[PDB]
Short mmCIF file of C-alpha atoms in Angstrom, two decimals:
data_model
loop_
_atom_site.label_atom_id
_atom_site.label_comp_id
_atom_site.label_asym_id
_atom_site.label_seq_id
_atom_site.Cartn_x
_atom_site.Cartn_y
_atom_site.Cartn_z
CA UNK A 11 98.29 42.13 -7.91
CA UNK A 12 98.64 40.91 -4.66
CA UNK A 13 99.90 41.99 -1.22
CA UNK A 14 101.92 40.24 1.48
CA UNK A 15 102.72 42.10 5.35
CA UNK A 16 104.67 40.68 7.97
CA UNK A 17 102.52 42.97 10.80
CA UNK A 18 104.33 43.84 14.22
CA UNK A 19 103.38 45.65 17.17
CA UNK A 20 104.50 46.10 21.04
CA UNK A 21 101.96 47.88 23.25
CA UNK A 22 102.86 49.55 26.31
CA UNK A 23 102.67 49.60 29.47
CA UNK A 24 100.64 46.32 28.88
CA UNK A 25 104.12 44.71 27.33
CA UNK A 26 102.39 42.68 24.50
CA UNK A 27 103.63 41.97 21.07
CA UNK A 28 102.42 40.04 18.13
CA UNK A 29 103.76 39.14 15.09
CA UNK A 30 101.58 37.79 11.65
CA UNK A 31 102.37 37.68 7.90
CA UNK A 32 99.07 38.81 6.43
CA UNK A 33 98.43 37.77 2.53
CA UNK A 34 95.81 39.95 0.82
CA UNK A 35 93.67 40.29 4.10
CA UNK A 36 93.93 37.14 5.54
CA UNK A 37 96.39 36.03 8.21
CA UNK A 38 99.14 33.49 6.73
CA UNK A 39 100.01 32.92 10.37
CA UNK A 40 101.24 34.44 13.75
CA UNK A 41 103.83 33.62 15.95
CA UNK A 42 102.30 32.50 20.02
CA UNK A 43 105.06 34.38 22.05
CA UNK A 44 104.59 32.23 25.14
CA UNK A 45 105.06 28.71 22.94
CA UNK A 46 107.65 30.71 20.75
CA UNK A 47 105.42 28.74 18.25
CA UNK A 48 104.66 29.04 14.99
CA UNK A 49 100.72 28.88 14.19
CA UNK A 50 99.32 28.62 10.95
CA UNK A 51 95.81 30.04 10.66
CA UNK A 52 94.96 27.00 8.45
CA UNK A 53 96.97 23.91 9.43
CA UNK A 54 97.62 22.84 6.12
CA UNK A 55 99.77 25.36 5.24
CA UNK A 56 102.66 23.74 7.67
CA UNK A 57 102.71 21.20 5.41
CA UNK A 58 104.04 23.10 2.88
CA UNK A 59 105.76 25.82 4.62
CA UNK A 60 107.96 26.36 7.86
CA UNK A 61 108.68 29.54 9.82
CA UNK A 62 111.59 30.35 12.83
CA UNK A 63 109.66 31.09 15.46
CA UNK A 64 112.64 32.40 17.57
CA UNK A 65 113.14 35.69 15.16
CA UNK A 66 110.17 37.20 15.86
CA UNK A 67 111.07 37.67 19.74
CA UNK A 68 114.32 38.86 18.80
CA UNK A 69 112.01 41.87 16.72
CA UNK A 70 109.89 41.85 19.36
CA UNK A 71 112.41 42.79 21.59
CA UNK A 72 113.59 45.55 19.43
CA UNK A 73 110.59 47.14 18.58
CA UNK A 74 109.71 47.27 22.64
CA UNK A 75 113.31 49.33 22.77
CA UNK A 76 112.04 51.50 19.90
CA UNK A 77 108.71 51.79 21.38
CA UNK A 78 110.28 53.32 24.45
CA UNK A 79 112.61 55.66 22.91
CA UNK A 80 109.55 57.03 20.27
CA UNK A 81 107.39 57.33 24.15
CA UNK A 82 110.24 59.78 25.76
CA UNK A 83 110.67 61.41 22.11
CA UNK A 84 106.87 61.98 21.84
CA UNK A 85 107.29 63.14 25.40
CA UNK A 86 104.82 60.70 26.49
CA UNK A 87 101.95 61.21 24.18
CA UNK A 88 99.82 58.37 24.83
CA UNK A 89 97.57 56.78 22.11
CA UNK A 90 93.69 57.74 21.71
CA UNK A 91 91.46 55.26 21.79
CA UNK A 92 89.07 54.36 18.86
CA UNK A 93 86.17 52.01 19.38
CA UNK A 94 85.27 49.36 17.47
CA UNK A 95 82.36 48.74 15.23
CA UNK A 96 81.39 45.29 15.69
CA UNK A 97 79.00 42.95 13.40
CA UNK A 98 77.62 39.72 13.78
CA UNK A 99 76.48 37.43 10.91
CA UNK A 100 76.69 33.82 10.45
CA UNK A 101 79.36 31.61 8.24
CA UNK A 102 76.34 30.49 6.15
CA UNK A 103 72.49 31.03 6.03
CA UNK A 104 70.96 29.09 8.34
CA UNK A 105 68.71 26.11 8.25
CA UNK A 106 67.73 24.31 11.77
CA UNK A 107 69.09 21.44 12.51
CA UNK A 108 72.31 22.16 10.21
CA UNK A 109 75.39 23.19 12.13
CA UNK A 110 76.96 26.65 11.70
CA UNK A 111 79.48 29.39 13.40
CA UNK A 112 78.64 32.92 14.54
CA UNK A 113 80.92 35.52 13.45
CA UNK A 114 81.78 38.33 15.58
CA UNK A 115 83.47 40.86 13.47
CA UNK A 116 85.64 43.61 15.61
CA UNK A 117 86.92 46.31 13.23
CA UNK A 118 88.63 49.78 13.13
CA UNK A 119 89.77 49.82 16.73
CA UNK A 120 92.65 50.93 18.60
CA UNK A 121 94.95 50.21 21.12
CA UNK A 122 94.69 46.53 20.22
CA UNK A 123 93.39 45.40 23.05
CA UNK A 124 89.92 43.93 24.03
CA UNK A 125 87.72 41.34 26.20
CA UNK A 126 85.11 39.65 23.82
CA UNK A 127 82.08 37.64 25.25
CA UNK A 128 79.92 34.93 23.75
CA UNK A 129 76.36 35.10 25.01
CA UNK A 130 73.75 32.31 24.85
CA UNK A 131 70.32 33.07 26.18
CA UNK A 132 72.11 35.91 28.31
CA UNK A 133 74.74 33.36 29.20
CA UNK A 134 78.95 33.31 28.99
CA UNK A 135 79.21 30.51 26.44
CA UNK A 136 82.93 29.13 25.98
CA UNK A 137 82.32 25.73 24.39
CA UNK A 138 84.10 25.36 20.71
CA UNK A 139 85.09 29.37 20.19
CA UNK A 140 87.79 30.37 19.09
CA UNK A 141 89.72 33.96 17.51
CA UNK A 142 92.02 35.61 15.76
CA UNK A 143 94.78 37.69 16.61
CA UNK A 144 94.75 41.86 16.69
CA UNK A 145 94.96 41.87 12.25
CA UNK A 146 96.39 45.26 10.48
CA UNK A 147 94.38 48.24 8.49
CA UNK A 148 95.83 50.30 6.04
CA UNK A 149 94.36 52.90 8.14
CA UNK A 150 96.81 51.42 10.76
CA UNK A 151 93.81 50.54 13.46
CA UNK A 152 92.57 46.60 14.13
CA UNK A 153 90.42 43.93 12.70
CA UNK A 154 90.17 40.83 14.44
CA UNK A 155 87.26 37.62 14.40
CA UNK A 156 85.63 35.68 17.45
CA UNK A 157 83.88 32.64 16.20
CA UNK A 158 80.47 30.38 17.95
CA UNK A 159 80.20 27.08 16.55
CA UNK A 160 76.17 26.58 17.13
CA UNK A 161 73.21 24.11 16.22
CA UNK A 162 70.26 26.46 15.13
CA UNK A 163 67.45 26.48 17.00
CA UNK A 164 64.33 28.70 17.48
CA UNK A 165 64.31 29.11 20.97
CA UNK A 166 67.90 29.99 21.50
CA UNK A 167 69.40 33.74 21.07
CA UNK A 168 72.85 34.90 21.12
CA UNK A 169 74.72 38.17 21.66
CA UNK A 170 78.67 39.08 21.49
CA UNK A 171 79.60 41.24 23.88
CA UNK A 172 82.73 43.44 23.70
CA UNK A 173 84.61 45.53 26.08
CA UNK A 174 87.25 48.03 24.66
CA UNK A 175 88.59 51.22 26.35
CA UNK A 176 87.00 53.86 23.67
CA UNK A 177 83.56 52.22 24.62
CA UNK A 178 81.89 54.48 27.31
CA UNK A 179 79.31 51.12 28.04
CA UNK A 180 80.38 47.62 26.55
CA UNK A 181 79.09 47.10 23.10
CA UNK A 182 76.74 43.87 22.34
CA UNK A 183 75.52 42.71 19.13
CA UNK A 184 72.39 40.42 19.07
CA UNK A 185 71.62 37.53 16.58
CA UNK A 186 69.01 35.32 16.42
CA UNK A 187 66.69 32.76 13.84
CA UNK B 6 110.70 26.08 2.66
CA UNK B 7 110.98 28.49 5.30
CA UNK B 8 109.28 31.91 4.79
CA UNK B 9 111.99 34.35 5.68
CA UNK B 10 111.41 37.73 7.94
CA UNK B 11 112.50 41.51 7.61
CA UNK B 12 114.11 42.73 11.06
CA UNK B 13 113.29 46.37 12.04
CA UNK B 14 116.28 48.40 12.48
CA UNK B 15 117.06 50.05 15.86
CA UNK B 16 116.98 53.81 16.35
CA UNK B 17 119.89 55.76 18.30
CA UNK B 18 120.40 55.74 21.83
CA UNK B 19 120.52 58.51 23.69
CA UNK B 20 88.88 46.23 38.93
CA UNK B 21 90.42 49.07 36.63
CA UNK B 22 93.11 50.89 34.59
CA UNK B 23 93.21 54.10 33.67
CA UNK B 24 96.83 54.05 32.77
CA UNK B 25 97.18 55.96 29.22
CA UNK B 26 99.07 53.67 26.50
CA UNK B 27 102.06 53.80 23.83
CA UNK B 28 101.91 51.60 20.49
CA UNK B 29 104.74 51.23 18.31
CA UNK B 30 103.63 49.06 15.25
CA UNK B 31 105.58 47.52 12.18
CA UNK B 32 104.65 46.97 8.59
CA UNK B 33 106.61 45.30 5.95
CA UNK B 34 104.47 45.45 2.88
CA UNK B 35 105.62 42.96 -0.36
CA UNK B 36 103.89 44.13 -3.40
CA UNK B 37 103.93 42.58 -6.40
CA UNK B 38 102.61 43.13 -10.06
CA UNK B 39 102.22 40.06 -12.40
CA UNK B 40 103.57 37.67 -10.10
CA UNK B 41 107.30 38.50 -9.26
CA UNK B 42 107.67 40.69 -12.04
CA UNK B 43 106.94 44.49 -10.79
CA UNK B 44 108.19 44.26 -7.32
CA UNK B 45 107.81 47.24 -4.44
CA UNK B 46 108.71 47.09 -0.90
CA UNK B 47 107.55 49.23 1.86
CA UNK B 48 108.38 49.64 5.14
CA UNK B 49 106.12 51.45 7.71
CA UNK B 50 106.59 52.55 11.34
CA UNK B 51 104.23 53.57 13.46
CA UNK B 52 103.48 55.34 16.85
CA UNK B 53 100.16 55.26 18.23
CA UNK B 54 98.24 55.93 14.79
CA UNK B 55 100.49 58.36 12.91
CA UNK B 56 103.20 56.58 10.45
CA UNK B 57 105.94 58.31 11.12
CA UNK B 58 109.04 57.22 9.17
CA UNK B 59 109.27 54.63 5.94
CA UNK B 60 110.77 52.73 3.61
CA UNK B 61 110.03 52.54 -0.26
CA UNK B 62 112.15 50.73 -2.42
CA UNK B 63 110.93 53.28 -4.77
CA UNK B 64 112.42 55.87 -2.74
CA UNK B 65 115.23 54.04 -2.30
CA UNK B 66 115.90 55.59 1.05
CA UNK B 67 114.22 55.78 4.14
CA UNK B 68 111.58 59.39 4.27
CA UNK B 69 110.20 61.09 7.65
CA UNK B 70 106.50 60.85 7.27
CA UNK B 71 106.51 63.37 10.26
CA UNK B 72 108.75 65.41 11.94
CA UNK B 73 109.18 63.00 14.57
CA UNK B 74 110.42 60.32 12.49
CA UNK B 75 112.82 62.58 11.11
CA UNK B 76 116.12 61.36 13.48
CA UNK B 77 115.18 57.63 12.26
CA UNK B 78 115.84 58.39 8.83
CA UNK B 79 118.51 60.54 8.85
CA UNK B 80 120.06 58.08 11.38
CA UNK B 81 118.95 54.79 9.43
CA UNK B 82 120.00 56.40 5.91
CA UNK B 83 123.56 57.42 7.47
CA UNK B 84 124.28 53.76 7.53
CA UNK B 85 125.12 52.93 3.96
CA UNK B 86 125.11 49.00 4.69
CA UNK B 87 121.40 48.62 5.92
CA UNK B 88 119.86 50.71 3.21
CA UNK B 89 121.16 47.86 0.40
CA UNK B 90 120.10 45.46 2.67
CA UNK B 91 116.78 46.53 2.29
CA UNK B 92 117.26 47.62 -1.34
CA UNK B 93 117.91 44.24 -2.21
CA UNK B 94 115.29 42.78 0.30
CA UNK B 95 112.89 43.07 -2.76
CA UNK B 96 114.16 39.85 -4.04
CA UNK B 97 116.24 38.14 -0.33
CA UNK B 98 112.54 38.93 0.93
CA UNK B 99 109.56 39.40 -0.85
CA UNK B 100 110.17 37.47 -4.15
CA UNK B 101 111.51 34.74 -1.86
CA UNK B 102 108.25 34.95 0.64
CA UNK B 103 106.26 34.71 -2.52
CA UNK B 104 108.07 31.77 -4.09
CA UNK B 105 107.72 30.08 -0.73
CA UNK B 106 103.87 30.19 -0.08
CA UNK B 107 102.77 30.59 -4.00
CA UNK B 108 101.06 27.26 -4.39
CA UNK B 109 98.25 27.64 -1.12
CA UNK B 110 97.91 31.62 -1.22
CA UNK B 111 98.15 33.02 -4.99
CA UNK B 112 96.81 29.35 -6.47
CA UNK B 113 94.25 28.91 -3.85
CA UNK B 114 90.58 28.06 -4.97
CA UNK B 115 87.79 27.05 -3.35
CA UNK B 116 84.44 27.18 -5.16
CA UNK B 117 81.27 29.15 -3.81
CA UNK B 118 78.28 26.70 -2.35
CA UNK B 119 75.33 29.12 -4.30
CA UNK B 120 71.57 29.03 -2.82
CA UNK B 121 68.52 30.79 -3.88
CA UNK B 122 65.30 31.20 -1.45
CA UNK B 123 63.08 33.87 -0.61
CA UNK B 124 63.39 36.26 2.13
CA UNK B 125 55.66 44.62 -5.23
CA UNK B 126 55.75 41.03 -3.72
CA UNK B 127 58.95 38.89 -3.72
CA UNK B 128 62.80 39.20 -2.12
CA UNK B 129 65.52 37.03 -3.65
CA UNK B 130 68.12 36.13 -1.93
CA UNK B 131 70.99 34.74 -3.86
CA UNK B 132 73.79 33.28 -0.78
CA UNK B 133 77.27 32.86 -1.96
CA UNK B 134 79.14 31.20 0.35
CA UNK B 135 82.65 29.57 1.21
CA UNK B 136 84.82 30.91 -1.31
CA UNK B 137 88.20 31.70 -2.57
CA UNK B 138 89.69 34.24 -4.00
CA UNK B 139 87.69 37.05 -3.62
CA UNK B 140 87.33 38.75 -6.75
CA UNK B 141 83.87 37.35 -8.04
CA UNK B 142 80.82 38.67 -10.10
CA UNK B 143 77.26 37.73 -9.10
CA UNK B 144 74.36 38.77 -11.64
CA UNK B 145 70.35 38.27 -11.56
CA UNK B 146 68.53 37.60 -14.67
CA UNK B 147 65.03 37.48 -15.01
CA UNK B 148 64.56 35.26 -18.15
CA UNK B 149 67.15 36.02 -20.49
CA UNK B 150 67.73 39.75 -19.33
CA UNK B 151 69.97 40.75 -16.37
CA UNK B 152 68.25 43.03 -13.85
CA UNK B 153 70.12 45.42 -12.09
CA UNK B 154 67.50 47.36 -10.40
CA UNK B 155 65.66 46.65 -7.77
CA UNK B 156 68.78 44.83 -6.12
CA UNK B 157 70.68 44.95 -3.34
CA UNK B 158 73.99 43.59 -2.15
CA UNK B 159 76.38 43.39 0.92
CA UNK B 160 79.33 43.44 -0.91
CA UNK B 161 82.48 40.98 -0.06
CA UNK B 162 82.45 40.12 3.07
CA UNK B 163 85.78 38.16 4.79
CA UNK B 164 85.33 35.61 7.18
CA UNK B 165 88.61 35.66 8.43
CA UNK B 166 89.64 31.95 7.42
CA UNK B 167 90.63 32.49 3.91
CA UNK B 168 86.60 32.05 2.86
CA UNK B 169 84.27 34.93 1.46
CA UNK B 170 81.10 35.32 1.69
CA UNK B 171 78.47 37.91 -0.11
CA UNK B 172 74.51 38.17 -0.27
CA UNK B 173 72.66 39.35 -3.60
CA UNK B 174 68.96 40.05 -3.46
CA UNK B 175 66.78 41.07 -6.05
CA UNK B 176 63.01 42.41 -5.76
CA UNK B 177 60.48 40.35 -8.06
CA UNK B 178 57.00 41.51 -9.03
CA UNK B 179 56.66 37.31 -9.75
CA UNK B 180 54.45 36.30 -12.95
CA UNK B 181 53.62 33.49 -14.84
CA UNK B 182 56.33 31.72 -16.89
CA UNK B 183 59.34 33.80 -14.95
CA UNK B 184 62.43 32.22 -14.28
CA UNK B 185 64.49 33.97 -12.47
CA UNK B 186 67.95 33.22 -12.24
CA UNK B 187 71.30 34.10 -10.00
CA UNK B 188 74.52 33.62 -11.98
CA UNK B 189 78.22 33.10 -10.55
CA UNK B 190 81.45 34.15 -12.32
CA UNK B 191 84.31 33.00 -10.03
CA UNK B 192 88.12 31.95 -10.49
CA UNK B 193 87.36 28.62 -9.02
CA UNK B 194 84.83 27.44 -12.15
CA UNK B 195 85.30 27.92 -16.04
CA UNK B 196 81.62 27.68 -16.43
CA UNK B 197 79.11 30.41 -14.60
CA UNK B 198 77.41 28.43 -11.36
CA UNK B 199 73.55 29.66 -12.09
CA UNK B 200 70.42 28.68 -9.49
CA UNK B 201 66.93 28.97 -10.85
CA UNK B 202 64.05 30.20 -8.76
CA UNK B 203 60.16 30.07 -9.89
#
């Protein structure tokens, strides 16, 4: 048994769209709308496989139309918000002096949209992240990873913070040795 | 070879920010049953959170989840054309999609890195790291018995780059002569990984 969605959403009014083939959980890849690039969540897999970038901002473009005749037929029902929960564990137990990456796990959230912070002794960190894009539920909300490359240390501590409009303060999950 | 894409159909025509918002989201689901063999397609819509009108190549035709989806399937299932199309998309589309990426997604394997170490007297932690798929079996054994009380476990946890990850622990009253010992059963290894503590 396995699974395989091709995930697509357009958000208004913030006019975004995304568009990711999913395989049993994990992202095969998405498509960058700006490059109209196709990005393969593990570069190896464009060795073996290819994908027309150009298609999915032709369904983009369709299911913004759709989105705006479901708003007038829904007489302008907007969404409701759902916070995330948010957890924050490491890629592998951690000895000092052996490099390793912070996870920050955002889960079962919607409107896909959020502003995620890396924090090093209270401090915006930027150096080696990276993320995910917004990944599908069954339950039709949002997963999606930030990640901290980091060399262990006892004196350092770290927190992600994340901002999300169902959030009445933002949310920030410490980790330290 | 190039993974193909299902195209949504289109429905009839007729500082701050506190502006309220409108989602419209897409699912084409491929599943499949012994490889290529039992084959299912579904397609979901969704506005906001509520699916509202789908697909299922069961159904053969598309069904209003609610009554707002109602006009899209009456409208999509008028057009005698499109519903084949996705009839047949079970093999144009998913068997094709799962021909294309079989080889790094159903035959991926990469083996779990296994480490024992401490955390009534004693917690065991057996780390399971780095691996692929995610159907696994992790089991503590004090000597020659397996122990399942006294032991508790995160469950599989994704990482989000095609690795898992999970965390077994087991409380020890240690005593002389007591090996205790973490065994792995995973897709990646015909033999069971095992780490022995003392």
């Amino acid at each position: 048994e396995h699974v395989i969605i091709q995930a697509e959403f357009y958000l208004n009014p913030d006019q975004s769209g995304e568009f990711m083939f999913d395989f049993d959980g994990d992202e095969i890849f998405h498509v960058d709308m700006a490059k109209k690039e196709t990005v393969w969540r593990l570069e190896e897999f464009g060795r073996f496989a290819s994908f027309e970038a150009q298609g999915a901002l032709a369904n983009i473009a369709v299911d913004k139309a759709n989105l705006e005749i479901m708003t007038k037929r829904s007489n302008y029902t907007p969404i409701t918000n759902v916070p995330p929960e948010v957890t924050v564990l490491t890629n592998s137990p951690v000895e000092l002096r052996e490099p390793n990456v912070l996870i920050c796990f955002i889960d079962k959230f919607t409107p896909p949209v959020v502003n995620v912070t890396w924090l090093r002794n209270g401090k915006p960190v930027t150096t080696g992240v990276s993320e995910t894009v917004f990944l599908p539920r069954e339950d039709h909300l949002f997963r999606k990873f930030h990640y901290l490359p980091f060399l262990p240390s006892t004196e350092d501590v770290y927190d992600c913070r994340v901002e999300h409009w169902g959030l009445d303060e933002p949310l920030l999950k410490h980790w330290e040795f | 070879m190039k993974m193909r894409m299902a195209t949504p159909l289109l429905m009839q025509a007729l500082s701050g920010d506190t502006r309220p918002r409108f989602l419209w989201q897409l699912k084409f689901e491929c599943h499949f049953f012994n490889g290529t063999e039992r084959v299912r397609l579904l397609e979901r819509c969704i506005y906001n959170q509520e699916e509202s009108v789908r697909f299922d190549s069961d159904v053969g035709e598309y069904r209003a989840v609610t009554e707002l989806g109602r006009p899209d399937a009456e409208y999509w299932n008028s057009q005698k054309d499109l519903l084949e199309q996705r009839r047949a998309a079970v093999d144009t589309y998913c068997r094709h999609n799962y021909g294309v990426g079989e080889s790094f997604t159903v035959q991926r394997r990469v083996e779990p890195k296994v480490t024992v170490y401490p955390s009534h007297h004693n917690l065991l932690v057996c780390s399971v790291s780095g691996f692929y798929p995610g159907s696994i079996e992790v089991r503590w054994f004090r000597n020659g018995q397996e122990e399942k009380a006294g032991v508790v476990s995160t469950g599989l946890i994704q990482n989000g780059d095609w690795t898992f990850q999970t965390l077994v622990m087991l409380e020890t009253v240690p005593r002389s002569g007591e090996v205790y010992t973490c065994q792995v059963e995973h897709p990646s290894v015909t033999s069971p990984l095992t780490v022995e503590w003392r």
